[PDB]
């Protein structure tokens, strides 16, 4: 009407400018008051003519228009005024925290943390046990939310915490929140009264109960600690939850002192405790997994006399059975020598023993040199105790190794020298000795000595042969052939063969031989004869073959010259 | 109050010798046997594989050769005798003896007379304490 | 006077008791003082009346009288006092050692050991060469006296000491005092440079000079020893004396080492060396007694080819000429076989050869049996060397004997039968 602009420059920044066919009209929108060329800031809620907001609706000016805002929980619908609608079904009329539930109320909406939780509905700072089952209140970033302990716990792998571990110094003041124990640290909280100075702490803590069944929710359990002689004098209250996969999680809070620490039993994940030494018999019992020695090491005095020693080329070692020390009450063993820089340590080859080493010289590790003319000797002392201090008995083991000063040494590699040798062949013709004798008796006792003898036909002529030399046991005497001759000349046609072809002659039963080929003594017996003719003298000649018993049988097995 | 119990242990040092090829005593052999000629020079040295104390010196009390591995054999050819080198042959030499742990004797090859083809080497040795004994062999000469 | 005893019991044991007609008088003798019934011990030099001992004479008491003793060298003569007299003319005023001379001196006598001796005249410890000629200081019992070495020496009959003897092991540290060499041990100390490893010792000692003439006194002589290649590098000094009967005696002291020993040459007491083999021609020369082979055995190669063999009925022998071995430089011969229990030794029938024996069996002495159809054979090897070890050449002699397996035998005794 009266605000017809010539150009858009006559519209302000508080009015909307509209160009229609290049004709500029300024019309100032609701929430600004005036004619339209100039409209200054003034709420549409208070202008001549007013607006159209319902009775409850508190008119609010906006830069460009006007809005009818009802008491939050109701919204103005045209022709109806304030009408009921949920405000927690619109993601722009509600922004409550992820764990806060929205509740539309008359005039606003409230954000409400769930039952148990303690908060305003913007941070739902829950307390232990204030969550529903399966969830626990744990921090996440900078707020506290209900999360399952099986996904929000920490883990602990402190080997020291082992009950047998008696050395060290600890304090569990750091521990808060849920924790788990995996690996060396053990599988579960200790459930038994633990001795003093165990679990690397002064006073050990243990669980006063039995772990719940798998997937049982958070349950509270009693906790006990041991000191002096009274076990579980003061009683606490810890909480424990089982998780799927067979493990547990625990609320390990700082103790009331600085010498209290929780313990764990051995995992014993293997049915048979093969980790334990072969000399510490494993006890394979249901629910009772451990290992201990048999009766042999259940006695005190003989254990005090028990030991073993080993002298090496460059080092000396003395060792005692750890089981024996444990049986003598020395669960922890302290081995010291004349020089404190040398300290005992585990065998690391056979775990039963515990041993210390000493270099075989004078000056290091306190070893000395005792020498005499025969051979040198090294002497050193071993000190045994249960702790640093000694109260009742101070047993010192005096040991020594003897090293011989004179010994045999042999070079192993033999030698095969080469020499230029000259060989020249030499040969020599030789001759054995053979002789025969004429005996008188059938027992072959006296030889003759005269150049000639006289005899009768009826007389029996016993003769034997012998070797005056070369009486080898394996060389036998074999009569290849024997014959008689009228003259000393061997080459005579007139021969009377007596032994022929290794067999005795026939046509006369007096031709006998007692032995032939058996041994060196060959005897033939025959009664006297005379050559036919002018021949008065008769001689005896023989040929003989020496027979080797190794190869030839050399018995004449003459079945008979006839047959 | 203290309890004392005596304990004793028999021990044994380690001693070994090697057959070197060079006059510089560089490479030991490893085979169980070797072949050589008479003109070849046989260089041998001894060492302690353990207990190398600075004051313990190596002294050759006597060395000898044997045709067989058996030490108790009547046929012995003493090379080192009474801490002094053998005579009747100028090739019998020792560079060091008693000075330190490295004792070396040099001699050229020989062969036993007879059917004996193989020759072995044996030695006896006395460890000498430098604190008291001089342990130098000052052998003016086995002859004179 | 006032000591008239009624009986001898009133005389003491310090007074002399005299019975005259059964009247007992006690008079105490000089050296005891009193009245006579009791006289207690007191020197007589101070009694009422003094005494009579010469000025020089010390007033000495004796058990029974008072004596006067002068400075030993003078003796108290009555009326004169101390009078000069020799004390070494009385066997009771002198007891000097048998070799000590007595000298009477003013106030004593002295016993004097002779010139050279070092003693007090009680124990004359003489030293070598401190005696007069014809005598030397040697122990006798528990003292040292000057005695002739020809009657106080020891003797030695060690055959080993011979120069040719090259085996063995010795040390002359025991030898001290005078010694002689008789018999096999030789007649006199070696006078020539001896080769190495001789006289059964490592280094041989010899005399550096020529023995003195018979009955020349103790004379010192140079001594030499041989080692390595240098002969008489170090020089000592020995002493030697000739004795009647044509032999010598020597001062053999321990050497400075334990491989030194004196040698002797061959005695050769026989003009011709008949002991030497008939194949080692004796050299009958004045002052040069030995024996060596002729030119036939003065060559090396043919000697290496030279040998002889003998096959016996039960034993086999191989031998080589010892002269040939010596010519080949093998002065000592070492013969070994396949079994070391067999060792060579001297022939003992003809001394020229050296031989070894082997029983004709299999198993002893390493002999084996090689057999074929014709006749058996025995083979064995001989090893030769100069010493235990072999350095340059190892010559082994292969020898064998052939024993026929078929042979002719004849009964010697003929027969003369009787027939009707
Ligand atoms: C069953 O068993 C029996 C018993 O074992 C066997 O019989 C034996 O057989 C052996 C093997 O033949 C014989 O050994 C040889 O003996 C001869 C000498 O024999 C005589 O002397 C011995 C001892 O007294 C006697 O027993 C034997 O009977 C002979 O006696 C009489 O000798 C005269 C001659 O003077 C005869 O006329 C006579 O008939 C005979 N009487 C008989 C037979 O009753 C010996 O000389 C032989 O040595 C030769 O061989 C060696 C080995 O090769 C050589 O040594 C080597 O020499 C090399 C060169 O220097 C050297 O480098 C090498 O290192 C060296 N080796 C060693 C190990 O030392 C000898 O030097 C030598 O060399 C041979 O010499 C002969 C000459 O003698 C050469 O012959 C000549 O040849 C030329 C041509 O080239 C011409 O033709 C000439 O005319 C000819 O003369 C020959 O060539 C040379 N060889 C070479 C150089 O290679 C050897 O020791 C046993 O004696 C014998 N025993 C008996 C009792 O009979 C029988 O055989 C067995 N039967 C069966 C079936 O198995
Ligand atoms: C040069 O140097 C070398 C090197 O040092 C010297 O050689 C060494 O010498 C040492 C001193 O003698 C020896 O020590 C002794 O060793 C024996 C055991 O020796 C054997 O074993 C060792 C180790 O393996 C080995 O080296 C040695 O060679 C021996 O091996 C062999 O053993 C068999 C036997 O099984 C032999 O048959 C065999 O021949 C042998 N081989 C050989 C020799 O080559 C050890 O037993 C000794 O201990 C004894 O002495 C201790 C000190 O007194 C006692 O301790 C004390 O006991 C008291 C009681 O309980 C206690 O109250 C006290 O507090 C305690 N003291 C201390 C400090 O602890 C021992 O108990 C023990 O007591 C003696 O025991 C023996 C038996 O063994 C008794 O002898 C018996 O006596 C009765 C009569 O009464 C009958 O006659 C029995 O028949 C007889 O057997 C003896 O009486 C007991 N004495 C008591 C009770 O007082 C000691 O440790 C070294 O081994 C030796 N080394 C070598 C390599 O040889 C050498 O000598 C030097 N030379 C020179 C010149 O200087
Ligand atoms: C692992 O386990 C260990 C051991 O449990 C945890 O460490 C410590 O645990 C204790 C015990 O939970 C905490 O102490 C206090 O716990 C109460 C619990 O109250 C909430 O849950 C109630 C239901 O819970 C039951 O079950 C639990 C066991 O799970 C029992 O302990 C309970 O007693 C119940 O039986 C619920 O009923 C509560 O609401 C009502 O009651 C309480 C009564 O105290 C009222 O306040 C409420 O207004 C309401 O009416 C509640 O939902 C907490 O409420 C305690 O909060 C204290 O601290 C707040 C801030 O620090 C403070 O704002 C509170 O007002 C209150 O402080 C006041 O009251 C205390 C009463 O003891 C006084 O101590 C204090 O002086 C003051 O007067 C408190 O949290 C330890 O805090 C806790 N310590 C740590 C370091 O965590 C360990 O946390 C576990 N690990 C985890 C969860 O990861
Ligand atoms: C076979 O022959 C062998 C080889 O000769 C004998 O073996 C050893 O021989 C030697 C040499 O004789 C002995 O050594 C010493 O000898 C002197 C000799 O002195 C006496 O005689 C002097 C004259 O002799 C001359 O001729 C001889 C050769 O025949 C020469 O050796 C001499 O040098 C002369 O040339 C005479 O003059 C001496 O008196 C004076 O001079 C000496 C100088 O040394 C002074 O002492 C005297 O006081 C005096 O002034 C003397 O009469 C000995 O005197 C030696 O005695 C030593 O030992 C005594 C005890 O052991 C000791 O009391 C002495 O004091 C003296 O020891 C001192 O002097 C030594 C000098 O070398 C030092 O060595 C020593 O360190 C110390 O300082 C000594 O005896 C060997 O002893 C002797 N060995 C053995 C084992 O016998 C062998 O004996 C003969 N076999 C027999 C006789 O059967
Ligand atoms: C050393 O020995 C003790 C026990 O000593 C044992 O009993 C003594 C009275 C003597 O007879 C000893 O010679 C004998 O070895 C071990 O301590 C433990 O003692 C208790 C005591 O009651 C044992 O309990 C018994 O066990 C048996 C078998 O199961 C039951 O039948 C009984 O009813 C009772 O429960 C316990 O077994 C035992 N522990 C063992 C043997 O390991 C000590 O441990 C042992 N030391 C060594 C290193 O072996
Ligand atoms: C001033 O506020 C009151 C509430 O305090 C208003 O009364 C409300 O009026 C609306 C509109 O009719 C009602 O909504 C209705 O709800 C039913 C049930 O959900 C639905 O079916 C209808 O379609 C409609 O949405 C609402 O229930 C009612 N509230 C009460 C408590 O009765 C009143 O209208 C307001 N004044 C003005 C001028 O708007
Ligand atoms: C004190 O001692 C001295 C000697 O030191 C005495 O003088 C010695 O007197 C005697 C006796 O007259 C002398 O002996 C005489 O010797 C000669 C020669 O042999 C001989 O012919 C005499 O017959 C007599 O034996 C002696 O020589 C003399 N000595 C000296 C050195 O003159 C003196 O008499 C002594 N006094 C007393 C009181 O004993
Ligand atoms: C324009 O307003 C009329 C009348 O509403 C009246 O005036 C308003 C400013 C406010 O004061 C109301 O409460 C007054 O009633 C709306 O018509 C409806 O009128 C009835 C009768 O009173 C009333 O009950 C309803 O709530 C009104 N409907 C509404 C306010 O939506 C008319 O609908 C309004 N036009 C719109 C909002 O576009
Ligand atoms: C007894 O004594 C007289 C006198 O000797 C003097 O008195 C001695 C004890 C003694 O001291 C002497 O030296 C005194 O001279 C002996 O007569 C000799 O007198 C002279 C003169 O003095 C004197 O030189 C002589 O040596 C004396 N003769 C000795 C002492 O033999 C008298 O001989 C003595 N009677 C004896 C010894 O039987």
- Pairing type for strands A406-410 and B120-129 reads antiparallel
Report the distance separating Cα A394 and Cα A391, nearest Å. 8
Give the 3-state secondary structure of residue B77: strand
3-state helix/strand/coil string of A415-445: EEEECECCEEEEEEECCCCCEEEEECCCCCC
Give the 3-state secondary structure of residue C238: strand
- Interacting residues of A248 by C-beta distance below 8 A, sequence separation 6+: A180, A188, A189, A211, A240, A241, A242
Chains touching B, CB cut-off 8 Å, 3+ pairs: A, C
Pocket test for ligand 5, best of A279, A280, A296, A298 (most atoms within 8 A of CB): A298
- Four-residue CA torsion sign, C204, C209, C210, C215: negative
The 10 Å Cβ neighbour count of residue A22 is 6
Report the distance separating Cα A82 and Cα A80, nearest Å. 7
Residues A369 and A473 in one domain: no
Q: Which of B105, B98, B12, B102 is nearest to B57 (CA)?
A: B98
Nearest CA, atom 2, ligand 3: A251
The 10 Å Cβ neighbour count of residue C263 is 26
Pocket test for ligand 6, best of A56, A58, A74, A86 (most atoms within 8 A of CB): A74
Give the 3-state secondary structure of residue A544: strand
Of C212, C237, C262, which one is at a domain's C-terminal end?
A: C262
C-alpha distances in Å from residue C163, one per residue of A20, C204, C266, C352: 159, 8, 8, 20
Report the distance separating Cα C145 and Cα C97, nearest Å. 11
Residue A13 lies in a domain: yes
The 10 Å Cβ neighbour count of residue C318 is 25
Contact A277, A352 (CB under 8 A): yes
Report the distance separating Cα B19 and Cα B32, nearest Å. 11
Residue B6 lies in a domain: no
Residue C228 lies in a domain: yes
Residue A268 lies in a domain: no
The answer to whether the CB atoms of B31 and A413 lie below 8 A apart is yes
Report the distance separating Cα B112 and Cα B133, nearest Å. 37
Report the distance separating Cα A144 and Cα C79, nearest Å. 155
Report the distance separating Cα B128 and Cα B110, nearest Å. 30
Q: Angle B50-B51-B52 (CA atoms, 0-180°, nearest 5)? A: 95
Nearest CB partner across the interface for C391, out of B38, B114, B144: B38
Question: Phi first, then psi: what are they for A484, rounded to 5°?
Answer: -105, 150
Of A380, A402, A424, which one is at a domain's C-terminal end?
A: A402
C102: which strand partners?
C111
- Interacting residues of C15 by C-beta distance below 8 A, sequence separation 6+: C26, C27, C28, C29, C32, C36, C39
Half-sphere exposure of C234 (CA within 13 A, CB side): 15
Report the distance separating Cα A426 and Cα B71, nearest Å. 37
Q: Please give the helix or strand (H or E) that residue A322 lies within, else none.
A: helix A322-327
Residues in chain A: 563
Q: What radius of gyration do chain C's Cα atoms show?
A: 43
Contact A475, A538 (CB under 8 A): no
- The B residues from 9 to 48 touching A (CB cutoff 8 Å) are 9-17, 19, 29, 31-38, 42, 44, 46
The answer to whether the CB atoms of B114 and C340 lie below 8 A apart is yes
- Interacting residues of A543 by C-beta distance below 8 A, sequence separation 6+: A480, A481, A482, C406, C408, C409
Half-sphere exposure of C260 (CA within 13 A, CB side): 21
Question: Phi first, then psi: what are they for A180, rounded to 5°?
Answer: -135, 160
How was this structure determined? It was done by cryo-EM
Report the distance separating Cα A102 and Cα A113, nearest Å. 9
Residues C111 and C171 in one domain: no
CB contact C225 to B (< 8 Å):
yes
- Pairing type for strands C74-77 and C65-69 reads unpaired
Contact A398, B9 (CB under 8 A): no
C81 lines ligand 7 (CB under 6 A): yes
Q: Please give the helix or strand (H or E) that residue A147 lies within, else none.
A: strand A143-147
Residue B139 lies in a domain: no
Question: Phi first, then psi: what are they for A102, rounded to 5°?
Answer: -80, 135
Report the distance separating Cα A507 and Cα A496, nearest Å. 13
- Four-residue CA torsion sign, C114, C120, C125, C130: negative
Question: Phi first, then psi: what are they for C324, rounded to 5°?
Answer: -60, -45
Which one-letter DSSP state was computed for residue A46? Answer: G
Report the distance separating Cα A30 and Cα A67, nearest Å. 10
Give the 3-state secondary structure of residue C301: helix
Which one-letter DSSP state was computed for residue A184? Answer: G
DSSP per-residue letters across C334-390? EEEESSTT-B-EE-SSSTTEEEEEEESSSSGGG-EEE--SS--EEEEEEEEESSSEE
Give the 3-state secondary structure of residue C322: helix
In the sheet that B103-108 helps form, which strands lie side by side, from edge to edge? B16-20, B41-47, B103-108, B93-96
Contact A520, A466 (CB under 8 A): yes
Residues in chain C: 420
Q: How would you class C320 by CB atoms within 10 Å of its CB: exposed for 0-12, middle for 13-18, buried for 19 or more?
A: buried
The answer to whether the CB atoms of B19 and A411 lie below 8 A apart is yes
Q: Beta-strand (E) ranges in C272-324? A: 282-285, 288-291, 308-311, 315-321
Question: Phi first, then psi: what are they for C160, rounded to 5°?
Answer: -45, -45
Q: Which of A437, A453, A442 is nearest to A527 (CA)?
A: A442
Give the ligand with the smallest distance to the CA of A140: 3
Q: Which of C56, C71, C72, C82 is nearest to C109 (CA)?
A: C72
Contact B144, C257 (CB under 8 A): yes
C-alpha distances in Å from residue C80, one per residue of A291, A507, C54, C57, C83: 125, 144, 9, 12, 7
Report the distance separating Cα C250 and Cα C177, nearest Å. 8
CB contact C238 to B (< 8 Å):
no
The answer to whether the CB atoms of C403 and A542 lie below 8 A apart is no
Q: How far off is chain C from A408, nearest CA to CA, in Å?
A: 24
Q: How far apart are the first and last CA of chain C?
A: 148
DSSP per-residue letters across B126-144? EEEETTT-------S-S--
Closest ligand 5 atom number to CA of residue A327: 48
Report the distance separating Cα C324 and Cα C307, nearest Å. 9
Q: How would you class C24 by CB atoms within 10 Å of its CB: exposed for 0-12, middle for 13-18, buried for 19 or more?
A: middle
Ligand 9 centroid distance, CA of A397 (Å):
96
The 10 Å Cβ neighbour count of residue B29 is 13
- Pairing type for strands A423-429 and C396-402 reads parallel
Q: What radius of gyration do chain A's Cα atoms show?
A: 64
Ligand 2 centroid distance, CA of A327 (Å):
30
Compute the 3-state secondary structure of chain A and give helix, strand, coil in percent, each to the nearest 5.
Answer: 5, 40, 55
Report the distance separating Cα C39 and Cα C27, nearest Å. 9
Total number of domains constituting chain B? 1
Q: How would you class A410 by CB atoms within 10 Å of its CB: exposed for 0-12, middle for 13-18, buried for 19 or more?
A: middle
Ligand 4 centroid distance, CA of C153 (Å):
19
The answer to whether the CB atoms of B126 and A406 lie below 8 A apart is yes
The 10 Å Cβ neighbour count of residue A70 is 21
Report the distance separating Cα A43 and Cα A26, nearest Å. 19
Contact C327, C303 (CB under 8 A): yes
Ligand 3 centroid distance, CA of A207 (Å):
22
Report the distance separating Cα A59 and Cα A502, nearest Å. 164
Q: Which of A1, A30, A4 is nearest to A15 (CA)?
A: A30
Q: Which of C287, C213, C205, C214 is nearest to C251 (CA)?
A: C205
3-state helix/strand/coil string of B43-60: EEEEECCCCCCCCEEEEE
The answer to whether the CB atoms of A307 and B7 lie below 8 A apart is yes
Residues C49-76 as b or e (16 or more Cβ within 10 Å = b): eeeebbeebebebeeeebbbbbeebbbb
Give the 3-state secondary structure of residue C303: helix
The 10 Å Cβ neighbour count of residue A153 is 23
C-alpha distances in Å from residue C111, one per residue of B102, C86, C115, C302: 67, 14, 13, 79
- Interacting residues of A202 by C-beta distance below 8 A, sequence separation 6+: A196, A227, A259, A260
DSSP per-residue letters across A329-368? T-SS-EEEESSTT-B-EE-SSSTTEEEEEEESSSSGGG-E
The answer to whether the CB atoms of B114 and C259 lie below 8 A apart is no
- Resolution in Å, one decimal place: 6.1
Contact A185, A263 (CB under 8 A): no
Helices (H) and strands (E) in chain B, counts: 0, 11
A177 lines ligand 3 (CB under 6 A): yes
Give the ligand with the smallest distance to the CA of A331: 5
Compute the 3-state secondary structure of chain B and give helix, strand, coil in percent, each to the nearest 5.
Answer: 0, 45, 55
C49 lines ligand 9 (CB under 6 A): no
Residues A175 and A256 in one domain: yes
Nearest CA, atom 4, ligand 8: A52
Q: Which of A339, A331, A327, A264 is nearest to A298 (CA)?
A: A327
Report chain B residues whose CB lies below 8 A from the CB of C336. Answer: 113-114
Report the distance separating Cα C196 and Cα A445, nearest Å. 64
Q: Please give the helix or strand (H or E) that residue A475 lies within, else none.
A: strand A475-485
Report chain B residues whose CB lies below 8 A from the CB of A412. Answer: 32
Which one-letter DSSP state was computed for residue A134? Answer: T
- The A residues from 239 to 278 touching C (CB cutoff 8 Å) are none
Q: Please give the helix or strand (H or E) that residue A379 lies within, else none.
A: strand A377-385
Contact C347, C319 (CB under 8 A): yes
Which one-letter DSSP state was computed for residue A132? Answer: P
The CATH number given to whatever domain includes residue C382 is: 2.60.40.3210
Nearest CB partner across the interface for A407, out of B15, B32, B33: B15
Contact C153, C228 (CB under 8 A): no
* Cα–chain center distance at A89: 65
Question: Phi first, then psi: what are they for A107, rounded to 5°?
Answer: 100, -10
CB contact B120 to A (< 8 Å):
yes
Contact C315, C357 (CB under 8 A): yes
Report the distance separating Cα A264 and Cα A205, nearest Å. 9
Closest ligand 1 atom number to CA of residue A425: 69
Report chain C residues whose CB lies below 8 A from the CB of B110. Answer: 389-391
Helices (H) and strands (E) in chain C, counts: 3, 31
- Interacting residues of A61 by C-beta distance below 8 A, sequence separation 6+: A31, A43, A44, A45
Report the distance separating Cα C207 and Cα A409, nearest Å. 45
Chains touching A, CB cut-off 8 Å, 3+ pairs: B, C
Contact A366, A410 (CB under 8 A): no
Q: How would you class A300 by CB atoms within 10 Å of its CB: exposed for 0-12, middle for 13-18, buried for 19 or more?
A: exposed
Ligand 8 centroid distance, CA of A76 (Å):
10
* Cα–chain center distance at C65: 59
* Cα–chain center distance at C17: 67
Report the distance separating Cα C259 and Cα B81, nearest Å. 13
Residue B122 lies in a domain: yes
DSSP per-residue letters across C8-40? GGGS-SSSEEEEETTEEEEEPPTTEEESSSSEE
C333, two tokens = 């011969």
Of C262, C290, C323, which one is at a domain's C-terminal end?
A: C262
Report the distance separating Cα A516 and Cα C152, nearest Å. 77
The answer to whether the CB atoms of A436 and C409 lie below 8 A apart is yes
Report the distance separating Cα A242 and Cα C98, nearest Å. 126
DSSP per-residue letters across C160-171? GGBTT-------
Q: Which of B22, B65, B33, B64 is nearest to A413 (CA)?
A: B33
Residues A365 and A443 in one domain: no
Q: Which of A481, A476, A470, A477 is nearest to A430 (CA)?
A: A470
Report chain B residues whose CB lies below 8 A from the CB of C388. Answer: 75, 77, 112-113
Residue C108 lies in a domain: yes
A357, two tokens = 């080493």
C353, two tokens = 């050869």
Report the distance separating Cα C384 and Cα C328, nearest Å. 12
Q: How would you class A88 by CB atoms within 10 Å of its CB: exposed for 0-12, middle for 13-18, buried for 19 or more?
A: middle
Q: Which of C57, C60, C62, C61 is nearest to C73 (CA)?
A: C57
Nearest CB partner across the interface for B35, out of A371, A403, A416: A416
- Pairing type for strands A414-418 and A368-370 reads unpaired
Which one-letter DSSP state was computed for residue C327? Answer: H
Residue C288 lies in a domain: no
Ligand 1 centroid distance, CA of C312 (Å):
21
Report chain A residues whose CB lies below 8 A from the CB of C412. Answer: 451
Domain limits for position C53: 8-84
């Amino acid at each position: 009407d009266t605000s017809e602009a010539r150009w858009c420059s006559e519209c302000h920044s508080n009015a909307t400018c509209t160009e229609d066919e290049a004709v500029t009209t300024c019309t100032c929108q609701e929430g600004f008051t005036g004619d339209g060329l100039t409209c200054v800031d003034l709420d549409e809620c208070a202008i001549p003519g007013a607006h159209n907001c319902s009775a409850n609706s508190s008119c609010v000016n906006t830069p460009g228009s006007f809005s009818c805002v009802c008491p939050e929980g109701f919204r103005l619908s045209p022709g109806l005024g304030c009408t009921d609608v949920d405000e927690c079904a619109e993601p722009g009329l509600s922004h409550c925290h992820a764990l806060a539930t929205c509740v539309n109320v008359v005039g606003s909406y409230l954000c409400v943390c769930p039952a148990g939780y303690r908060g305003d509905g913007w941070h739902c700072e829950c307390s232990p046990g204030s969550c529903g089952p399966g969830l626990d209140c744990v921090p996440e970033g900078d707020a506290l939310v209900c999360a399952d302990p099986c996904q929000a716990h920490r883990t602990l792998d402190e080997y020291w915490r082992s009950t047998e571990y008696g050395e060290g110094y600890a304090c569990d003041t750091d521990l808060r929140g849920w924790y788990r124990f995996v690996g060396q640290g053990g599988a579960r909280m200790a459930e038994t009264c633990v001795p003093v100075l165990r679990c690397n702490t002064a006073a050990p803590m243990w669980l006063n109960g039995t772990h719940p069944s798998s997937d049982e929710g958070i349950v509270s359990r009693k906790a006990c600690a041991h000191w002096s002689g009274h076990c579980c004098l003061w009683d606490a209250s810890v909480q424990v939850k089982a998780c799927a996969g067979g493990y547990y999680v625990y609320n390990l809070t700082a103790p009331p002192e600085c010498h209290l620490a929780y313990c764990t039993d051995p995992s014993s994940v293997e049915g048979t405790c093969e980790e334990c030494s072969i000399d510490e018999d494993c006890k394979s019992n249901n629910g009772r997994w451990h290992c201990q020695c048999k009766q042999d090491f259940n006695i005190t005095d003989i254990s005090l006399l028990e030991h073993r020693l080993e002298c090496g080329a460059n080092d000396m070692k003395v060792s005692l059975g750890k089981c024996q020390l444990k049986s003598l009450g020395f669960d922890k063993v302290f081995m010291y020598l004349s020089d404190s820089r040398c300290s005992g340590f585990n065998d690391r080859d056979n775990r039963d023993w515990v041993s210390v080493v000493t270099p075989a010289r004078d000056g290091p590790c306190g070893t000395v040199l005792t020498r005499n003319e025969t051979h040198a000797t090294y002497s050193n002392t071993l000190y045994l105790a249960d702790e640093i201090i000694i109260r009742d008995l101070n047993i010192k083991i005096n040991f020594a190794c003897s090293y011989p000063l004179d010994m045999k040494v042999s070079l192993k590699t033999a030698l095969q020298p080469m020499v230029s040798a000259l060989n020249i062949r030499v040969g020599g013709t030789g001759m054995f000795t053979v002789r025969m004798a004429l005996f008188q008796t059938p027992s072959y006792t006296q030889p003759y000595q005269g150049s000639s003898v006289t005899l009768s036909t009826e007389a029996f002529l016993y003769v034997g042969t012998m070797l005056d030399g070369g009486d080898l046991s394996r060389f036998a005497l074999l009569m290849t052939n024997c014959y008689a001759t009228p003259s000393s000349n061997a080459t005579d046609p007139l021969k009377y063969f007596i032994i022929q072809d290794r067999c005795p002659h026939t046509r006369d039963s007096t031709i006998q031989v007692v032995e032939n080929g058996e041994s060196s003594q060959g005897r033939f017996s025959v009664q006297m004869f005379r050559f036919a003719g002018n021949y008065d003298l008769v001689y005896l000649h023989c040929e003989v073959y020496l027979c080797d018993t190794m190869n030839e049988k050399c018995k004449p097995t003459c079945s008979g010259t006839r047959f």
